[PDB]
Amino acid sequence: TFTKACSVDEVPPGEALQVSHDAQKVAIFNVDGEFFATQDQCTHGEWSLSEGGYLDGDVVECSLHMGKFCVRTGKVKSPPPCEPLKVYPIRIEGRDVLVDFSRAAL
Amino acid sequence: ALKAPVVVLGAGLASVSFVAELRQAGYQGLITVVGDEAERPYDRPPLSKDFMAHGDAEKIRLDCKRAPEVEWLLGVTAQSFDPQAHTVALSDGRTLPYGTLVLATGAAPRALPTLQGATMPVHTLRTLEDARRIQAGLRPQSRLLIVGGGVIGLELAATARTAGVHVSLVETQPRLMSRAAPATLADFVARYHAAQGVDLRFERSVTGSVDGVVLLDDGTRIAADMVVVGIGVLANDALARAAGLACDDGIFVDAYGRTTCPDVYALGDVTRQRNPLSGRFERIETWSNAQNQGIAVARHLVDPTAPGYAELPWYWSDQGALRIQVAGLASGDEEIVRGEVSLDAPKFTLIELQKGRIVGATCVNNARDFAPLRRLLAVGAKPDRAALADPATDLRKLAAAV
Amino acid sequence: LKAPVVVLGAGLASVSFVAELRQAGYQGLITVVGDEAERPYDRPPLSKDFMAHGDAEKIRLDCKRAPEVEWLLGVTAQSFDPQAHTVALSDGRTLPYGTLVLATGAAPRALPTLQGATMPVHTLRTLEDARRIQAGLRPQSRLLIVGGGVIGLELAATARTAGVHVSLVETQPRLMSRAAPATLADFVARYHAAQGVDLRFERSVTGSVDGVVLLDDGTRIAADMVVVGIGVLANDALARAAGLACDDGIFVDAYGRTTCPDVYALGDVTRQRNPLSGRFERIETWSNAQNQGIAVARHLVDPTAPGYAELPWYWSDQGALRIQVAGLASGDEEIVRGEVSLDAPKFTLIELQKGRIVGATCVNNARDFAPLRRLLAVGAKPDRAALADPATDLRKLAAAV
Numbered sequence: 032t033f034t035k036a037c038s039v040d041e042v043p044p045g046e047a048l049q050v051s052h053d054a055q056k057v058a059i060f061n062v063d064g065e066f067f068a069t070q071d072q073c074t075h076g077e078w079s080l081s082e083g084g085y086l087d088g089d090v091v092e093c094s095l096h097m098g099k100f101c102v103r104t105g106k107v108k109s110p111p112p113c114e115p116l117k118v119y120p121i122r123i124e125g126r127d128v129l130v131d132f133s134r135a136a137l
Numbered sequence: 138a139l140k141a142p143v144v145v146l147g148a149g150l151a152s153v154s155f156v157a158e159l160r161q162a163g164y165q166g167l168i169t170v171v172g173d174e175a176e177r178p179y180d181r182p183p184l185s186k187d188f189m190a191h192g193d194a195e196k197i198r199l200d201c202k203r204a205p206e207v208e209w210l211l212g213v214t215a216q217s218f219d220p221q222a223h224t225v226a227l228s229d230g231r232t233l234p235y236g237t238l239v240l241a242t243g244a245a246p247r248a249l250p251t252l253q254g255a256t257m258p259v260h261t262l263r264t265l266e267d268a269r270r271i272q273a274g275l276r277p278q279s280r281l282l283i284v285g286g287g288v289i290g291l292e293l294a295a296t297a298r299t300a301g302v303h304v305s306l307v308e309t310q311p312r313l314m315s316r317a318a319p320a321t322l323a324d325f326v327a328r329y330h331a332a333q334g335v336d337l338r339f340e341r342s343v344t345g346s347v348d349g350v351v352l353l354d355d356g357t358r359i360a361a362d363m364v365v366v367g368i369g370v371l372a373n374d375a376l377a378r379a380a381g382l383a384c385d386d387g388i389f390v391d392a393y394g395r396t397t398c399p400d401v402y403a404l405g406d407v408t409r410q411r412n413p414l415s416g417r418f419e420r421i422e423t424w425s426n427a428q429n430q431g432i433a434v435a436r437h438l439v440d441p442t443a444p445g446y447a448e449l450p451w452y453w454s455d456q457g458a459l460r461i462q463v464a465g466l467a468s469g470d471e472e473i474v475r476g477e478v479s480l481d482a483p484k485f486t487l488i489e490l491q492k493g494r495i496v497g498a499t500c501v502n503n504a505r506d507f508a509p510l511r512r513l514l515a516v517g518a519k520p521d522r523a524a525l526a527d528p529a530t531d532l533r534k535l536a537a538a539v
Numbered sequence: 540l541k542a543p544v545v546v547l548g549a550g551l552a553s554v555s556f557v558a559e560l561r562q563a564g565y566q567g568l569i570t571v572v573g574d575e576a577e578r579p580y581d582r583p584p585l586s587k588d589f590m591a592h593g594d595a596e597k598i599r600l601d602c603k604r605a606p607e608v609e610w611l612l613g614v615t616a617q618s619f620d621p622q623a624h625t626v627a628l629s630d631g632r633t634l635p636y637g638t639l640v641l642a643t644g645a646a647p648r649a650l651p652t653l654q655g656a657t658m659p660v661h662t663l664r665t666l667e668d669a670r671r672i673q674a675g676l677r678p679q680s681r682l683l684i685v686g687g688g689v690i691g692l693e694l695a696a697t698a699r700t701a702g703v704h705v706s707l708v709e710t711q712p713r714l715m716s717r718a719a720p721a722t723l724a725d726f727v728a729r730y731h732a733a734q735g736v737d738l739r740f741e742r743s744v745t746g747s748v749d750g751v752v753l754l755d756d757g758t759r760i761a762a763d764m765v766v767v768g769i770g771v772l773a774n775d776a777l778a779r780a781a782g783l784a785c786d787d788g789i790f791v792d793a794y795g796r797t798t799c800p801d802v803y804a805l806g807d808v809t810r811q812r813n814p815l816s817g818r819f820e821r822i823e824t825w826s827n828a829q830n831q832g833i834a835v836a837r838h839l840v841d842p843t844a845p846g847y848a849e850l851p852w853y854w855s856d857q858g859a860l861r862i863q864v865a866g867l868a869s870g871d872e873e874i875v876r877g878e879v880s881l882d883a884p885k886f887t888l889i890e891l892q893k894g895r896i897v898g899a900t901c902v903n904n905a906r907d908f909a910p911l912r913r914l915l916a917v918g919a920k921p922d923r924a925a926l927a928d929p930a931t932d933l934r935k936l937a938a939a940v
């Protein structure tokens with residue numbers, strides 16, 4: 032069920048705001064105009080990717096161990112992470128940004 | 138000059154990181170990788186974390202996906218190589234020819250000789266065999282005695298606690314983590330550890346055991362149902378000294394990973410290289426090194442206009458309520474502090490300086506400072522002393538700008 | 540081994556390498572490159588007898604055991620490209636090499652404090668670096684000496700005998716700390732002390748005024764001259780710009796190899812495994828240079844020959860003393876032998892480590908040195924009782940036990 036995790040302004044270009052649906056912390060990023068929502072926790076040492084991390088393009092870097100992933104598929108672009116990020120479907124419906132905390136692919 | 142065939146001895150993190158840069162830099166010649174362990178190469182750091190918990194060897198698997206058309210020979214030992222024949226004898230009877238040979242055989246743990254014959258179990262923790270074994274020994278109502286107060290004693294202590302084991306810890310130094318942590322952090326962390334259910338014994342010694350009870354030098358008795366020895370690792374350079382290469386508990390290598398032996402390279406824990414920060418040839422026991430020296434060496438092998446390894450040392454430790462990152466030197470003539478050094482909300486950074494220049498820096502639960510201090514390190518910067526201590530200062534605009 | 544063979548430097552190390560390459564067989568080309576204009580000479584009689592007579596003829600190395608060598612004398616090597624297999628020299632001449640030997644040794648540490656400071660200021664290492672001294676050691680003169688190192692204390696005692704007023708200030712408590720035993724170093728300060736030499740300690744060094752030499756205790760040390768002996772540093776620049784593994788010397792295995800293929804290194808410029816502690820140090824002696832350089836040449840030529848494997852050892856002539864030191868200065872015990880005498884010395888210190896000899900020392904007592912080197916090399920654990928009985932024959936001991 033799609034549920035509105037934020038606004039299209041809370042999360043601006045090249046930035047990123049977590050979203051804590053239930054206890055389903057979810058990483059939201061804006062890349063040049065497109066939104067891609069991922070699992071907020073780094074698969075290596077479960078550090079927060081939206082808070083503290085560095086999105087360069089569509090690449091999120093981990094500040095803890097400086098590991099790197101793709102925000103569109105959740106695929107590691109650089110270890111230490113061994114596992115890909117699962118990622119959530121995401122709809123924009125005007126000024127609101129929809130995530131269905133189910134169907135989170137991996 | 139990189140000449141096929143390429144043969145690597147050891148299938149650890151350095152191996153893996155090494156051959157991916159071989160191919161994923163355009164080298165599609167023959168590669169063979171030998172490892173004396175039987176299992177897909179696995180990341181080591183997660184052993185001290187997750188693994189005691191949800192004991193999954195399947196999420197800590199080194200994913201050698203970036204190394205296509207590599208030959209792995211796992212469960213096979215290398216007994217010897219011949220620098221004059223340019224071959225390696227393996228345990229299963231086979232001969233490996235080489236134009237280029239890479240030693241990346243890591244380091245082994247130096248067990249207890251005083252706990253030579255203990256009626257109780259003891260493990261030195263360095264693999265996904267030992268891992269599985271301690272972990273599964275970690276029951277709720279139980280005892281465990283760790284010997285040594287470095288990162289493995291501390292990291293494993295922490296989860297032993299989360300386990301529900303009443304943990305105590307023998308330390309021969311008057312401090313924990315003498316090898317590579319500022320004293321402030323060490324003194325912090327021990328105080329961290331006391332306030333959790335871990336019983337610390339600095340300055341002491343394991344003189345022996347009795348039946349089911351430990352024996353500190355002070356005659357002390359300790360009922361331990363399980364013991365863990367993390368007294369440190371020694372290089373496995375055995376095949377190296379055997380064949381005449383330069384070795385002093387570790388194999389010496391220059392900036393491209395060259396040994397004193399033509400056609401033979403060396404990477405990772407097994408090696409002794411320059412610390413540009415100190416100028417001394419040290420063994421550098423970090424993941425960080427394991428990988429990046431890995432990469433820097435296989436790309437220079439494929440592109441010689443390219444530089445040799447130059448990066449600066451740094452590592453992490455994730456013990457309990459403390460995500461710690463340490464970079465460069467542990468020692469300075471001045472120390473600067475930021476944040477709140479509390480055992481319940483710890484979130485800070487230490488900066489170590491030497492006549493003004495940053496020689497090092499730690500971060501406890503403060504990742505956002507790490508990267509920018511490391512780059513400051515990398516250019517040996519001497520920033521404004523007062524600004525560095527000004528919490529309104531963000532170290533990123535400082536790192537980034539000038 | 541690959542011609543043409545090129546050796547950079549022409550000190551004892553290199554001259555022994557090529558003199559031995561030839562002997563060993565090698566009939567290939569060989570070019571040696573020496574920055575100083577001089578035919579290869581010997582350094583020990585520079586702080587010794589040269590100052591007694593001063594004839595360069597007298598302190599000359601035999602190159603006739605090394606026939607057919609293009610000695611480029613008076614030229615400096617500016618770099619080598621290992622990829623190119625070439626050396627760049629200052630005469631604009633290029634040198635292609637098959638095998639390259641770095642035998643550049645090291646240089647006299649300097650001291651800022653005497654940097655363009657009134658009176659003459661010197662270091663002793665080179666021949667030119669010996670006559671300016673020899674022209675300053677006027678029979679009537681004073682003089683001062685930094686560091687109680689092998690050349691400081693050898694020059695202190697060649698001084699005195701001329702009737703030239705020394706004055707030695709060192710930054711450490713005893714003498715000869717880099718290598719001598721503490722036992723040895725006390726007897727040498729009392730001996731020199733007994734010979735004039737106002738030996739000062741833990742006392743550096745500030746301000747020289749054509750009389751008022753430098754010092755932290757306002758002292759008219761008084762001298763027209765100053766010979767400075769504060770230790771030396773590896774000439775490892777070119778291997779360094781080359782990318783070889785260095786750290787105040789070039790790291791080499793027991794075969795002479797550096798981390799750059801086809802490049803070797805010998806003598807004082809190197810850092811090698813000392814088999815007593817098992818550490819890589821600079822072995823800055825006359826015997827290592829000679830011996831290491833021979834053993835590198837020997838295994839290069841013959842494929843089977845074993846690597847270099849001597850334990851350190853040196854000597855020092857200081858006045859009447861004839862000091863010979865073997866191995867490490869200390870262990871967990873020491874036995875003294877003979878006479879420890881002020882005016883007519885003759886004794887032997889042997890160091891032990893959990894009962895095995897690991898060190899020796901002999902002063903004006905050379906028949907005993909030779910056997911202890913022999914027991915020092917096998918790892919012997921002789922009986923300590925017998926070692927101390929002055930009737931025990933150390934040759935008898937060595938040549939059998």
Ligand SMILES: Cc1cc2nc3c(=O)[nH]c(=O)nc-3n(C[C@H](O)[C@H](O)[C@H](O)COP(=O)(O)OP(=O)(O)OC[C@H]3O[C@@H](n4cnc5c(N)ncnc54)[C@H](O)[C@@H]3O)c2cc1C
Nearest residue numbers: 147149150151172173181215242243405406423424427452
């Ligand atoms: C429990 C633990 C926790 C750690 N935590 C951290 C951390 O938080 N942060 C950090 O920065 N670092 C950490 N490290 C350090 C890091 O894991 C090492 O720096 C890294 O593993 C170095 O790997 P390597 O490939 O150089 O050597 P290894 O990883 O040991 O690889 C060597 C391989 O070679 C094999 N081998 C050896 N001899 C032979 C032979 N003769 N024939 C065939 N195969 C041979 C070995 O058995 C092994 O398979 C940790 C290490 C451990 C053990």
Ligand SMILES: Cc1cc2nc3c(=O)[nH]c(=O)nc-3n(C[C@H](O)[C@H](O)[C@H](O)COP(=O)(O)OP(=O)(O)OC[C@H]3O[C@@H](n4cnc5c(N)ncnc54)[C@H](O)[C@@H]3O)c2cc1C
Nearest residue numbers: 548550551552574582583616643644806807824825828853
């Ligand atoms: C005055 C003095 C007295 C000593 N007395 C004793 C003693 O009693 N006992 C003892 O055991 N030891 C003694 N020693 C030490 C011993 O003589 C040295 O260990 C030995 O000379 C070193 O051998 P080497 O050939 O490696 O070096 P060196 O003698 O330094 O020769 C190396 C040569 O390389 C040349 N070189 C350097 N760079 C270049 C370049 N770029 N191009 C070309 N040429 C270059 C140098 O100029 C030098 O001539 C003494 C040393 C000195 C200076």
Ligand code: FES
Nearest residue numbers: 073076093096098
């Ligand atoms: S937690 Fe992100 S790479 Fe370690």
